[PDB]
Design a protein around this motif. Structure first.
Motif, PDB file in Angstrom:
ATOM      1  N   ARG B   3      -9.716  65.851 -20.972  1.00 15.43           N
ATOM      2  CA  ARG B   3     -10.203  65.956 -22.338  1.00 15.43           C
ATOM      3  C   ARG B   3     -10.096  67.390 -22.846  1.00 15.43           C
ATOM      4  O   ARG B   3     -10.267  68.356 -22.097  1.00 15.43           O
ATOM      5  CB  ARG B   3     -11.654  65.484 -22.421  1.00 15.43           C
ATOM      6  CG  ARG B   3     -11.833  63.993 -22.177  1.00 15.43           C
ATOM      7  CD  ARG B   3     -13.298  63.623 -22.014  1.00 15.43           C
ATOM      8  NE  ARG B   3     -13.852  64.124 -20.762  1.00 15.43           N
ATOM      9  CZ  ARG B   3     -15.077  63.870 -20.317  1.00 15.43           C
ATOM     10  NH1 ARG B   3     -15.924  63.116 -21.001  1.00 15.43           N
ATOM     11  NH2 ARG B   3     -15.462  64.385 -19.153  1.00 15.43           N
ATOM     12  N   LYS B  31     -34.998  75.348 -25.816  1.00 12.31           N
ATOM     13  CA  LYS B  31     -35.845  74.788 -24.764  1.00 12.31           C
ATOM     14  C   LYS B  31     -36.774  73.752 -25.386  1.00 12.31           C
ATOM     15  O   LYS B  31     -37.761  74.098 -26.040  1.00 12.31           O
ATOM     16  CB  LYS B  31     -36.627  75.893 -24.061  1.00 12.31           C
ATOM     17  CG  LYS B  31     -37.716  75.391 -23.118  1.00 12.31           C
ATOM     18  CD  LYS B  31     -38.237  76.504 -22.227  1.00 12.31           C
ATOM     19  CE  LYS B  31     -39.476  76.069 -21.462  1.00 12.31           C
ATOM     20  NZ  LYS B  31     -39.230  74.865 -20.620  1.00 12.31           N
ATOM     21  N   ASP B  36     -44.479  70.219 -21.357  1.00 10.93           N
ATOM     22  CA  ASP B  36     -45.348  71.193 -21.998  1.00 10.93           C
ATOM     23  C   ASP B  36     -45.607  70.790 -23.447  1.00 10.93           C
ATOM     24  O   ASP B  36     -44.914  69.946 -24.020  1.00 10.93           O
ATOM     25  CB  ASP B  36     -44.732  72.595 -21.931  1.00 10.93           C
ATOM     26  CG  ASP B  36     -43.445  72.706 -22.722  1.00 10.93           C
ATOM     27  OD1 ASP B  36     -42.760  71.677 -22.895  1.00 10.93           O
ATOM     28  OD2 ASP B  36     -43.117  73.827 -23.166  1.00 10.93           O
ATOM     29  N   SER B  38     -45.236  72.513 -26.189  1.00 13.88           N
ATOM     30  CA  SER B  38     -44.574  73.407 -27.127  1.00 13.88           C
ATOM     31  C   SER B  38     -43.070  73.342 -26.907  1.00 13.88           C
ATOM     32  O   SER B  38     -42.607  73.262 -25.766  1.00 13.88           O
ATOM     33  CB  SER B  38     -45.072  74.848 -26.964  1.00 13.88           C
ATOM     34  OG  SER B  38     -44.404  75.722 -27.857  1.00 13.88           O
ATOM     35  N   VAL B  40     -39.513  75.456 -27.958  1.00 10.27           N
ATOM     36  CA  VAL B  40     -39.110  76.803 -28.349  1.00 10.27           C
ATOM     37  C   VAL B  40     -37.599  76.927 -28.213  1.00 10.27           C
ATOM     38  O   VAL B  40     -36.995  76.346 -27.305  1.00 10.27           O
ATOM     39  CB  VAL B  40     -39.833  77.874 -27.501  1.00 10.27           C
ATOM     40  CG1 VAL B  40     -39.380  77.812 -26.044  1.00 10.27           C
ATOM     41  CG2 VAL B  40     -39.619  79.270 -28.083  1.00 10.27           C
ATOM     42  N   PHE B  41     -36.991  77.690 -29.123  1.00  9.12           N
ATOM     43  CA  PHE B  41     -35.561  77.960 -29.104  1.00  9.12           C
ATOM     44  C   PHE B  41     -35.334  79.443 -29.363  1.00  9.12           C
ATOM     45  O   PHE B  41     -36.178  80.127 -29.945  1.00  9.12           O
ATOM     46  CB  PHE B  41     -34.810  77.115 -30.145  1.00  9.12           C
ATOM     47  CG  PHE B  41     -35.110  77.493 -31.569  1.00  9.12           C
ATOM     48  CD1 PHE B  41     -36.244  77.014 -32.203  1.00  9.12           C
ATOM     49  CD2 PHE B  41     -34.251  78.315 -32.278  1.00  9.12           C
ATOM     50  CE1 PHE B  41     -36.518  77.355 -33.513  1.00  9.12           C
ATOM     51  CE2 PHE B  41     -34.521  78.662 -33.587  1.00  9.12           C
ATOM     52  CZ  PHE B  41     -35.656  78.181 -34.206  1.00  9.12           C
ATOM     53  N   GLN B  42     -34.176  79.931 -28.915  1.00  7.89           N
ATOM     54  CA  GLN B  42     -33.769  81.317 -29.102  1.00  7.89           C
ATOM     55  C   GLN B  42     -32.334  81.358 -29.605  1.00  7.89           C
ATOM     56  O   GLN B  42     -31.514  80.507 -29.256  1.00  7.89           O
ATOM     57  CB  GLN B  42     -33.895  82.119 -27.796  1.00  7.89           C
ATOM     58  CG  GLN B  42     -33.461  83.576 -27.907  1.00  7.89           C
ATOM     59  CD  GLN B  42     -33.839  84.393 -26.688  1.00  7.89           C
ATOM     60  OE1 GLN B  42     -34.939  84.256 -26.152  1.00  7.89           O
ATOM     61  NE2 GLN B  42     -32.926  85.246 -26.240  1.00  7.89           N
TER      62      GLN B  42
ATOM     63  N   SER C  12     -50.876  69.002 -15.132  1.00 12.94           N
ATOM     64  CA  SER C  12     -50.399  70.374 -15.223  1.00 12.94           C
ATOM     65  C   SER C  12     -50.719  71.108 -13.929  1.00 12.94           C
ATOM     66  O   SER C  12     -51.746  70.852 -13.293  1.00 12.94           O
ATOM     67  CB  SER C  12     -51.042  71.093 -16.409  1.00 12.94           C
ATOM     68  OG  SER C  12     -50.701  70.462 -17.633  1.00 12.94           O
TER      69      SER C  12
ATOM     70  N   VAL L   2     -38.514  83.604 -24.094  1.00  3.89           N
ATOM     71  CA  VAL L   2     -38.428  82.335 -24.815  1.00  3.89           C
ATOM     72  C   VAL L   2     -39.431  81.326 -24.264  1.00  3.89           C
ATOM     73  O   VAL L   2     -40.069  80.589 -25.025  1.00  3.89           O
ATOM     74  CB  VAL L   2     -36.984  81.791 -24.774  1.00  3.89           C
ATOM     75  CG1 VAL L   2     -36.526  81.476 -23.341  1.00  3.89           C
ATOM     76  CG2 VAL L   2     -36.844  80.561 -25.668  1.00  3.89           C
ATOM     77  N   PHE L   5     -43.634  81.046 -25.126  1.00  4.09           N
ATOM     78  CA  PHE L   5     -44.226  80.472 -26.334  1.00  4.09           C
ATOM     79  C   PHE L   5     -44.878  79.137 -25.983  1.00  4.09           C
ATOM     80  O   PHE L   5     -44.287  78.061 -26.105  1.00  4.09           O
ATOM     81  CB  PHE L   5     -43.177  80.307 -27.426  1.00  4.09           C
ATOM     82  CG  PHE L   5     -42.837  81.587 -28.135  1.00  4.09           C
ATOM     83  CD1 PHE L   5     -43.653  82.068 -29.147  1.00  4.09           C
ATOM     84  CD2 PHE L   5     -41.705  82.306 -27.795  1.00  4.09           C
ATOM     85  CE1 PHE L   5     -43.346  83.242 -29.803  1.00  4.09           C
ATOM     86  CE2 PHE L   5     -41.394  83.482 -28.449  1.00  4.09           C
ATOM     87  CZ  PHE L   5     -42.215  83.950 -29.454  1.00  4.09           C
ATOM     88  N   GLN L   6     -46.128  79.223 -25.530  1.00  4.99           N
ATOM     89  CA  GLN L   6     -46.956  78.061 -25.242  1.00  4.99           C
ATOM     90  C   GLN L   6     -48.368  78.356 -25.732  1.00  4.99           C
ATOM     91  O   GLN L   6     -48.633  79.405 -26.327  1.00  4.99           O
ATOM     92  CB  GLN L   6     -46.939  77.721 -23.747  1.00  4.99           C
ATOM     93  CG  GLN L   6     -45.556  77.423 -23.193  1.00  4.99           C
ATOM     94  CD  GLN L   6     -45.589  77.034 -21.728  1.00  4.99           C
ATOM     95  OE1 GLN L   6     -46.650  77.014 -21.103  1.00  4.99           O
ATOM     96  NE2 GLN L   6     -44.425  76.721 -21.172  1.00  4.99           N
ATOM     97  N   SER L   7     -49.282  77.422 -25.482  1.00  2.00           N
ATOM     98  CA  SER L   7     -50.668  77.603 -25.891  1.00  2.00           C
ATOM     99  C   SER L   7     -51.292  78.749 -25.104  1.00  2.00           C
ATOM    100  O   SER L   7     -51.262  78.752 -23.869  1.00  2.00           O
ATOM    101  CB  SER L   7     -51.454  76.313 -25.676  1.00  2.00           C
ATOM    102  OG  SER L   7     -52.792  76.451 -26.121  1.00  2.00           O
ATOM    103  N   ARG L  15     -53.581  80.892 -19.667  1.00  3.86           N
ATOM    104  CA  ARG L  15     -52.999  79.581 -19.933  1.00  3.86           C
ATOM    105  C   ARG L  15     -54.096  78.657 -20.449  1.00  3.86           C
ATOM    106  O   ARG L  15     -55.004  78.279 -19.700  1.00  3.86           O
ATOM    107  CB  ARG L  15     -52.347  79.023 -18.669  1.00  3.86           C
ATOM    108  CG  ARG L  15     -51.762  77.611 -18.796  1.00  3.86           C
ATOM    109  CD  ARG L  15     -50.687  77.514 -19.872  1.00  3.86           C
ATOM    110  NE  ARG L  15     -50.108  76.176 -19.943  1.00  3.86           N
ATOM    111  CZ  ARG L  15     -49.176  75.701 -19.125  1.00  3.86           C
ATOM    112  NH1 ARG L  15     -48.686  76.427 -18.130  1.00  3.86           N
ATOM    113  NH2 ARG L  15     -48.726  74.463 -19.305  1.00  3.86           N
TER     114      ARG L  15
END
Lengths: 131, 54, 66, 212, 348, 105, 63, 64, 153, 35, 347, 66, 154, 63, 69
Positions: B3, B31, B36, B38, B40-42, C12, L2, L5-7, L15
């Motif tokens: 491909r 991410k 989790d 939350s 998150v991205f970068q 967790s 990166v 970024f959590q609570s 944490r």
């Protein structure tokens, strides 16, 4: 390789015919496997299988003495003279750690059955010579 | 047969033009995980322009 | 990984230690036996009994409000 | 899929199972595919005369399904009774449009050539088996690439490849024909066997490895 | 086919080997050839025995597949459980649905559960609620004083006990009963007869032990359930079912059955003096009372079957049984059923 | 298939033309004859599974399941015929009663 | 031996298997406080495990 | 769908990290067994508890 | 420390034609004798349930060999006692295994063959022979393995 | 299995629904009640 | 039950070790192991044979005793004869698998010979059996269709089949096999209402038969033939029901009568502008169709008529009444309602 | 980075998890309404009311010392 | 019936010259319909206390005058629904009802379905009903081909 | 079949969809205890969904 | 079934409006929406003539009593 199997490892230190003191086939470690997983980075053109376990800490760690909330266990016009009966309460008594520890281990060890073709943890673990 | 792939990334921004922003792209990470609480991205950007003031 | 196999609890990841042994908050119990001479009772948990040590009434027992 | 097999003289079903599937224990399920009674293989011909349908003898054709389809009950039921019809169903059925086989060869890359025909009585002709595959391949080769009104990219650029009959054009035509033949997933591959260019006429032949 | 034992097969093999142009061979014990022949003969005997067993099983399976006649499933055990409180309830209490009743003896770990709601009114020192055995089998026929545990029970409860053993749970349908019902069906293919009406009445699962008393232009059916009652809906269902099987142009009627009460006052001799106790007396009383129930209509009070049934509990422990007044069989009319009766045990 | 077909290729499958005595041939012939007899018995077992050809104990089982037991000194054919006919009583009809009386007579 | 032991255990009722488990647990409590019929001891358990079903050594097998 | 043609690397396997025998969904913490109605009614399997005895898993639901 | 026995087995255990290959001798082993006295005198614990519908349950008692051939029935009891005796020591209390010897099992297998051949004549009661043949090869393994076990232990 | 998102039939094993209510008497509780 | 190869082989090995002390090696390729494996394979084959026999027995063996035939998808076959120009002077060979193509183009059927045949030295004709390749009813062919042979010869002149192929067979499912048996067993019931109805329906020209039952007499009447019953049909059906009637109970057969109903209804419509000839004609047609379609011994309940007429359109109809219909009309068991004269008035 | 970024809460990194939901210690409240029939009250927080469920007085309420 | 209730309207509906050149109808009731119909006639079946989904084919038949204008055709519609309803029930629940239906019984439904479709097509009132039944005509044929194969699989 | 099932479901009312969901949950919680009709059985439940919807097995349907 | 019929009658009567007036035949049609095979005959002991609602008033259900016979 089904989980919870027992694996024994023996290491030969040095040459056999040389008659060194190392010729003892001393066991290095024995334990219960608890995880098997494929591993491989095909970019490098290589793969492996990894197995890990603990040295007989799995049964005690997993065996959690739970609590039952709503059991009465009554009898018709019959009762137990010693208190802490009918409920799941169990009391261990002894004047030393080796006396108490023997009762603690002996209470739950024989019923922790497994699918060994030959026995259970009591045969493998001596848990004696305590003081 | 093997491909053939020709990636072509586009970026749109809403409050500088988005197309100009997307031209200077170099790479990004995203991410996302349900384990989790939350996501998150970068995004990595080139140093051609002073993005700090924009 | 290999080193992660330690005492843990909860969905967790949390390091279980002596903190978990400590009881957080208040709990209820039922009165099963009362030492009338010292007026100190022993309360029963659903599957455990607090107090009730080798000492009969005096040396160890649960006080009561006055 | 299923591999054709012929019963050999003084041969047993156990050896037949062991040769292909490796383990003889699979023979218990293989007999149900053939739909045979307990006399699975019998040398005596007159013995088969009592019930030829539910019996097999030397020289008869057997069915050897692949391991994946061996355990499927549907495959067993279909192969029990269809027998020879499996090949036709495996390769499919379609209407036959080769009304004038002599005529369509004279007009290559020309529209309004193929048409329906009639065979039997009062019913449109149909084609099946390897003939259907060959007809479909010929239609695909004749059909230009970007002419069909739906599912485009079907056909070949044979009309555009006419040129100065030079070797590079011949190799280009060969590659175009090979790509056209190999487009269908049913065919494994193809390769040229002979090349012959004399004057202003291109001639050649190809071989195709059809599955089963 | 005919069963062939090991000795005959071994003898035939020995004869064939001797007659097969072989004089050097010998069949003395301890030889490899003799052992191999014995093993082969045992394999053939095993094959023949398994073939006969498979033939029997295939006959049963074909009879089951043939027609639309099949055995019915088992019945869950059920009974009554008594509850004793420390003191009468001062206020009304509600028992949550699905309350679980169990025991502590290792022999009977089977669980029980309630199906309907119940309420404990005030000034009531006891309450009785029906229970059903979750497991489908004879394990629910626990003895007296087995169920002694309750889940989600308040502190007011003082004791849990069942006054009588269940003796209601059953395994799958017996082969003999299924065979007899099939015989009734086969004999009932010819309609407009006593057996046809009998099968038409008995085909309903609820009804049990019906009787037919043919008369001049009048048919009477004394149908009853396991409890000896006949509800209007079940009566109408039986009539509708018999309508297809009823002979044309003749009257049909049904009026249930009338119950009768007799006190056996049985006495039993027990060999083991030590084993004698109140529990055994209660078990015997419950067994006799259950035997009185689940009895069909229009059959004399036979005493031989009674003594053979009660003696079936233990041939050695139970020595002899005798009776005072009911030695002679009591002839029951067509509309009489022997269900009720007070039992007093007088151990010698 | 047969025992000879599935036997080891190296083992002989015919009488030796050097000496009359052949213990190998004797054993192979005995085993083959026994297995062929067992095969013939197994083939005949199909008849016993069907009421149309069941005989002796199997016919007795069929009759017992149908409720028609064997009369004393009754042969298999008449017993099977009575078993089959017992499912066509057509009881209730006057001509059926006449036929039943004739059978009893 | 293992094959027929497994077949017998499968043929046993659920209550029979439960009683077998109970007997195994009881025997475990009382602990304290290549195969060849000839010239080998590894297959000793196979012969014993085959027994206790042809003979009703309890309501179920042991080991 | 995804075939093996798109797989760069893989790390997948079994794990006994999570192991529970008894499961329940208790109501809100306000309700209590001693001063109220039934508090819980857990569930278990007789064979599962042999290997892991009385391993509970409690979750509090605010809706109930 | 003994598992309670079934009621049926307890009742069963507590009390011309001749074959050309194997014949009996009505001899009892020393180990079998001790177990018989213990059950006869001591009141061993017993079970109350009879879920297991195998072995003597409805096979050894259902068959008419009890009333037709009481002498043959005696042979079956002897095999059961010998079968129970060897199972007793290995499962629990192995001290009683000392009294057992090779000749104890050798006679038992000969008795099993004699009764097994007689049962082959009857076509209805082949179910009993089904278990006996499997049990027949079990004793032979003990016969060819018992001497090694005692020396090893 | 790919048909209609059936997935693996082995996912709904025999222990998926078969279970029973949880109560005592399974270990230690019942040893003292053997009257 | 059946046992696999492994169990039998293990039992044989264990018994050999128990009995034989001279044998200890059981490596692959050993003569003794090969012999035991062959014996075990034959035993397993016999077990599978018994399993198949038991399957056939449970599926159709028990029913085979009763009068019914089973079909197993046997391919069609029949006798075919061949003729030659002159008598032969050699033993011509006819190998198996010879294809006898159909001369007619419309018939794509083909046939094959399973067994070889040897021509006589001088016979001028010979007849052989040929089996069709395709199973089912499709293999049937009419007479005088097979007149071509693939393996032609100069001596061969033509082929022909005097007798048609009747042995064409098709196999149905087990349920189809069982349903005919159930119908046959059910048909044997007698002296019941359903059995009498089935017996009456067996004879042709018998439809919509109604049965009325009483302790004194049993009366049966029908309108099978174009709404009417003939005397000859009554004579024919009286004799047939003699086997079906109960013993000692009288049987009677009579005709079917009808009672025409005259009705002059009135309907009030909310929207009087919608009235017209077509609407009233449609209402009259609906009423007469409803009254015509009445079951036997069905009382003419006025409530049902009101429900039927007012269900045409709830919004349209506001009130309804009947000028010449006092109450519901009761009919005897033998009567049937019919439309004599119907009139509808719009208000 | 990166993944950080959590609570989280507090000047120092911590944490935030189900532990923070649990209330550490004791709190005060005012009595707003009393169920006289059961003598169980519902107390008001400065911007919340504990109890006061759909159940009127009996099924759910706040007990009182006796 | 064993698992969930059914609508009241469907329960009420189910309990109860012109000829086509291509099709020849017949009144052969299926074996499955014989037993299932008795259960519907009897009260031993859960039933809801409310109705929804007015767009179903049942309400279309009730609204039109097919009952009085063509009761014979109305009867065939009930027969088609009866066989159609039963074959839905067995797959979702109660697999014991299998091996009581054959391809012949399902095949004759299409003959009756097409026979009544022609009569309904003579008038424009029954366009909605004709649009629904034609969709089921191809549905039954798929079941007929797979019913022998599904029966062996199960 | 799935296409016309989806098309028909789009016209259903809110109550019909709610009853369909409830019926699916009821069936779901008591379970354990190349389209071609010829020479295959893959498209079995697809045809049933349309037939159940148009005929009506419940207010909304099942499966 | 009596309770169901009473609920149906209540729903029918409550659905009427001031413009509409109670009619015996309309009530018969409403109650007879059930299949005629089940309900074979319906009659009113009290209602024998149509009732004319005044323009200001509206007719609706009060206390309904239904019985078999």
């Amino acid at each position: 390789v089904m989980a919870n199997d027992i694996i024994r490892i023996f290491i030969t230190p040095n040459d056999d015919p040389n008659d060194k003191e190392g010729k003892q086939e001393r066991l290095i470690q024995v334990g219960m496997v608890s995880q098997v997983s494929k591993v491989g980075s095909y970019g490098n053109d290589q793969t492996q299988f990894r197995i890990t376990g603990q040295s007989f800490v799995k049964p005690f760690m997993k065996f959690g003495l739970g609590v039952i909330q709503e059991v009465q266990a009554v009898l018709p016009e019959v009762g137990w003279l010693i208190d802490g009966d009918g409920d799941n309460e169990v009391k261990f008594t002894g004047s030393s750690a080796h006396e108490v520890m023997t009762g603690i281990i002996r209470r739950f060890i024989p019923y922790m059955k497994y699918n060994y073709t030959e026995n259970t943890i009591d045969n493998y673990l001596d848990y004696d010579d305590l003081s | 047969m093997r491909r053939i792939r020709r990636p072509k990334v586009r970026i749109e921004i809403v409050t500088y033009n988005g197309d100009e922003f997307g031209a200077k792209l170099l790479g990004f990470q995203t991410k996302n995980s349900m384990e989790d609480d939350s996501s998150v991205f970068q995004i990595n950007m080139a140093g051609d322009t002073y993005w700090d003031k924009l | 990984m290999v080193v992660r196999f330690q005492s843990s609890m909860g969905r967790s990841l949390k390091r279980v230690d002596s903190d978990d042994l400590n009881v957080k908050g208040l709990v209820l119990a039922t009165v099963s036996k009362i030492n009338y001479k010292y007026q100190s009772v022993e309360v029963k948990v659903n599957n455990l009994t607090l107090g009730s040590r080798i000492g009969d009434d005096g040396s160890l027992a649960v006080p009561y409000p006055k | 899929r299923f591999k054709k097999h012929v019963v050999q003289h003084e041969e047993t079903m156990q050896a037949i199972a062991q040769r292909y599937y490796g383990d003889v224990s699979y023979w218990i399920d293989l007999v149900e595919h053939n739909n045979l009674k307990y006399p699975y293989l019998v040398e005596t011909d007159e013995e088969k005369m009592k019930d030829p349908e539910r019996l097999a003898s030397t020289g008869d054709t057997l069915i050897i399904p692949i391991e994946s389809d061996l355990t499927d009950v549907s495959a067993k039921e279909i192969n029990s009774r269809d027998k020879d019809v499996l090949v036709e169903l495996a390769l499919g059925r379609d209407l036959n449009i080769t009304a004038d086989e002599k005529y369509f060869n004279e007009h290559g890359t020309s529209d309004n050539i193929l048409a329906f025909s009639t065979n039997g009585n009062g019913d449109l002709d149909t084609v099946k088996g390897i003939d259907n595959m060959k007809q479909q391949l010929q239609a695909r080769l004749l059909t230009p690439r970007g002419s069909l009104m739906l599912h485009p990219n079907y056909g070949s650029d044979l009309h555009n490849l006419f040129g100065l009959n030079i070797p590079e054009q011949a190799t280009l035509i060969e590659m175009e024909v090979l790509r056209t033949l190999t487009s269908d997933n049913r065919v494994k591959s193809a390769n040229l066997i002979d090349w012959k260019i004399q004057g202003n006429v291109y001639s050649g032949q190809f071989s195709v490895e059809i599955k089963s | 086919m005919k069963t062939r034992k090991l000795t005959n097969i071994l003898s035939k093999l020995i004869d064939k080997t001797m007659a097969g142009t072989s004089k050097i061979t010998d069949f003395t014990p301890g030889s490899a050839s003799r052992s191999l022949l014995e093993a082969v003969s045992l394999e053939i005997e095993q094959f023949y025995i398994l073939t006969k067993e498979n033939i029997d099983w295939g006959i049963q399976e074909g009879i089951i597949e043939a027609f639309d006649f099949q055995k019915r499933q088992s019945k869950r055990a059920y009974g009554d459980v008594t509850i004793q409180f420390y003191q009468p309830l001062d206020m009304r209490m509600y028992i949550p649905a699905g309350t679980t009743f169990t025991s502590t003896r290792q022999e009977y770990p089977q669980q029980f559960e309630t199906l309907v709601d119940y309420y404990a009114e005030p000034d009531s020192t006891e309450i009785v609620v029906e229970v059903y055995c979750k497991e489908t089998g004879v394990a629910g026929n626990v003895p007296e004083g087995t169920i002694n545990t309750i889940a989600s029970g308040s502190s007011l409860i003082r004791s849990v006990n069942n006054e009588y053993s269940f003796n209601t749970g059953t395994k799958e349908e017996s082969q003999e009963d299924f065979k007899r019902r099939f015989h009734s069906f086969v004999e009932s293919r010819g309609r407009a007869t006593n057996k046809s009406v009998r099968y038409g009445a008995l085909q309903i699962p609820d009804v049990e032990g019906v009787y037919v008393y043919e008369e001049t232009g009048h048919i009477t059916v004394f149908a009853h359930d396991r409890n000896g009652n006949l509800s209007d809906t079940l009566k109408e269902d039986i009539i509708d079912a018999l309508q297809d099987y009823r002979p044309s142009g003749i009257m049909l009627d049904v009026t249930g059955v009338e119950k009768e009460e007799v006190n056996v006052s049985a006495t039993v001799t027990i060999s083991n003096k030590s084993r004698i106790g109140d529990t055994l007396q209660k078990h015997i009383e419950s067994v006799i009372r259950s035997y009185l129930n689940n009895l069909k209509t229009s059959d004399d009070l036979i005493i031989t079957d009674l003594i053979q049934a009660i003696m079936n509990i233990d041939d050695v422990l139970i020595y002899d049984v005798s009776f005072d007044n009911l030695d002679e069989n009591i002839i029951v009319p067509p509309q009489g059923i022997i269900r009720a009766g007070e039992i007093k045990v007088e151990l010698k | 298939a047969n025992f000879l077909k599935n036997l080891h290729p190296l083992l002989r499958r015919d009488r030796n033309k050097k000496d009359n005595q052949d213990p190998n041939f004797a054993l192979i012939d005995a085993l083959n004859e026994e297995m062929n007899q067992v095969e013939k018995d197994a083939i005949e077992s199909k008849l016993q599974s069907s009421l149309k050809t069941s005989t002796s104990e199997y016919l007795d089982k069929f009759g017992d399941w149908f409720g028609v037991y064997r009369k004393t000194d009754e042969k298999d054919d008449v017993y099977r015929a009575r078993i089959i006919k017992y499912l066509l009583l057509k009881r209730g009809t006057n001509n059926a009663i006449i036929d039943a009386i004739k059978d009893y007579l | 031996a293992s094959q027929r032991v497994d077949e017998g255990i499968k043929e046993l009722d659920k209550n029979a298997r439960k009683t077998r488990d109970r007997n195994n647990q009881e025997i475990s409590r009382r602990e304290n406080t290549i195969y060849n019929p000839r010239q080998s001891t590894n297959g000793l358990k196979g012969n014993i495990d085959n027994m206790a079903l042809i003979i009703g050594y309890g309501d179920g097998g042991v080991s | 769908k995804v075939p093996t043609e798109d797989f760069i690397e893989e790390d997948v396997g079994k794990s006994d990290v999570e192991t529970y025998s008894i499961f329940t969904a208790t109501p809100a913490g306000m309700l209590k067994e001693l001063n109220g109605d039934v508090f819980s009614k857990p569930q278990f399997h007789p064979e599962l508890t042999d290997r892991y005895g009385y391993t509970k898993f409690e979750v509090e639901n605010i809706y109930l | 420390n003994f598992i309670p026995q079934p009621q049926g087995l307890l009742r069963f255990l507590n009390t011309s034609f001749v074959s050309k290959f194997y014949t009996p001798q009505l001899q009892l082993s020393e180990l079998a004798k001790k177990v018989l006295t213990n059950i006869k005198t001591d009141d061993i614990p017993v079970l109350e349930r009879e879920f297991n519908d195998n072995t003597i349950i409805h096979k050894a008692n259902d068959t008419l060999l009890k009333v037709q051939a009481p002498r043959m029935y005696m042979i079956l009891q002897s095999i059961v006692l010998e079968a129970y005796a060897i199972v007793n020591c290995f499962v629990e209390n192995p001290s009683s295994l000392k009294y057992l010897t090779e000749e104890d099992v050798s006679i038992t297998r000969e008795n099993l063959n004699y009764v097994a051949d007689y049962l082959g004549n009857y076509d209805d009661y082949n179910s009993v022979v089904l278990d006996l043949r499997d049990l027949d090869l079990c004793f032979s393994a003990i016969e060819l393995q018992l001497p090694l076990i005692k020396k090893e232990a | 299995i790919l048909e209609d998102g059936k997935g693996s039939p082995h996912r709904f094993a025999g222990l998926w629904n078969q279970s029973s209510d949880f109560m005592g008497g399974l270990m230690g509780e019942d040893t003292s009640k053997e009257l």
